[PDB]
C-alpha cells in the first residue's frame, strides 16, 4: 500500500537485483500487507502483558514502553523484540523501551480527572499530562 510500480517495473527490479547477487538464480518478490505487520506486533505485545503506547503516523509506526518495569518484564521484552526483528526487520515498526523510576512509592495521590501527588503533608505536585 505504499508503492505503485507496474509489472515491468518490478521485473526490471528483479533483473537489476539478480545482477547484484551472483550466487543467486532468481530473486522472488512477494508483496505483503502493511496492516498485518503492525497487527502481529500488537497482538504479541498484548499477550506478554507489557504496558505500552502506540503512536500511529504515516510511513511507519512506533511503540513506546515506559514505566518502572521489573526484572522479568525486561527479559520478556528482549525475547520478543529480538524474535520480531529477525522476522520483519526495523524499517516500519520500531520499539522504544525506556525505563524510569516511580515517584508514587510511599506517596498518597489522587488519580482520575484532576490528578495530584501529595509529596508530603505540606506539599502538592500538580503534573501536566
Amino acid at each position: 500500500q505504499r508503492n505503485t510500480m507496474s509489472k515491468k517495473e518490478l521485473e526490471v527490479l528483479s533483473q537489476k537485483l539478480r545482477a547484484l547477487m551472483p550466487y543467486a538464480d532468481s530473486v522472488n518478490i512477494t508483496l505483503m500487507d502493511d496492516v498485518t505487520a503492525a497487527g502481529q506486533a500488537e497482538a504479541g505485545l498484548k499477550q506478554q502483558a507489557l504496558p505500552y503506547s502506540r503512536r500511529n503516523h504515516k510511513g511507519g509506526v512506533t511503540f513506546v514502553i515506559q514505566g518502572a518495569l521489573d526484572d522479568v518484564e525486561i527479559l520478556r521484552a528482549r525475547q520478543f523484540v529480538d524474535s520480531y526483528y529477525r522476522t520483519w526487520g526495523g524499517r516500519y515498526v520500531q520499539f522504544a523501551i525506556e525505563l524510569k523510576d516511580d515517584w508514587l512509592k510511599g506517596r498518597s495521590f489522587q488519580y482520575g480527572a484532576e490528578g495530584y501527588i501529595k509529596m508530603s503533608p505540606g506539599h502538592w505536585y500538580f503534573p501536566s499530562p
Partner: protein, 144 residues
C-alpha cells in the same frame, strides 16, 4: 506518570486531615477536622461518588461525629461530645424548633429532647452545635 485507569484516592498512612481534604472536592464544602481527631490514621484505596453517605459510614467505623451548618463540615472525635440543659422563661420548645427548622440548622440525628410546651429541654451533640443552641436560647429570653 500516575498510571491507574479509574478514579479514586489512594492513601498510604494518611493522617485524617489530608484524607478529608481530598474528599473536600466531591463534597462541595470545606472540611474542618479537630485537633484530637487528627491523630488517627487510615490507609487504603477509596473512591467518592456519594460522600454524604460515605461520611456517615466512616464516622461510625472510625468513631466520629460530624455536623454540616450550611457553609462547612465540622468533624470531631467521639470523646468530645458535650451536653447542656437550659430553661426558657417565656418561649416554648416548639417555638424554638420552628426557628431552627426555618433557618436551616435543625439536625435530625441530634434532635432536642424535652417537653413540647415548657421552658426546659436537653441538648447534646458536637461542640459547635451545642454552643450555638445555648447561645441562641439565652439570646431570645433577653430579647423578649
Amino acid at each position: 506518570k500516575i498510571p491507574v485507569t479509574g478514579s479514586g484516592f489512594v492513601a498510604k498512612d494518611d493522617s485524617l486531615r489530608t484524607f478529608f481534604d481530598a474528599m473536600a472536592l466531591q463534597l462541595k464544602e470545606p472540611v474542618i477536622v479537630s485537633k484530637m481527631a487528627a491523630r488517627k490514621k487510615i490507609t487504603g484505596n477509596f473512591e467518592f461518588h456519594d460522600p454524604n453517605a460515605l461520611l456517615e459510614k466512616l464516622s461510625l467505623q472510625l468513631g466520629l461525629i460530624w455536623y454540616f451548618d450550611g457553609q462547612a463540615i465540622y468533624i470531631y472525635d467521639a470523646s468530645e461530645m458535650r451536653n447542656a440543659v437550659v430553661s426558657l422563661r417565656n418561649v416554648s420548645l416548639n417555638e424554638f424548633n420552628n426557628f431552627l427548622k426555618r433557618s436551616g440548622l435543625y439536625n435530625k440525628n441530634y434532635p432536642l429532647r424535652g417537653d413540647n410546651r415548657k421552658g426546659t429541654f436537653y441538648v447534646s451533640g458536637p461542640p459547635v452545635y451545642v454552643d450555638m443552641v445555648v447561645n441562641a436560647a439565652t439570646m431570645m429570653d433577653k430579647q423578649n
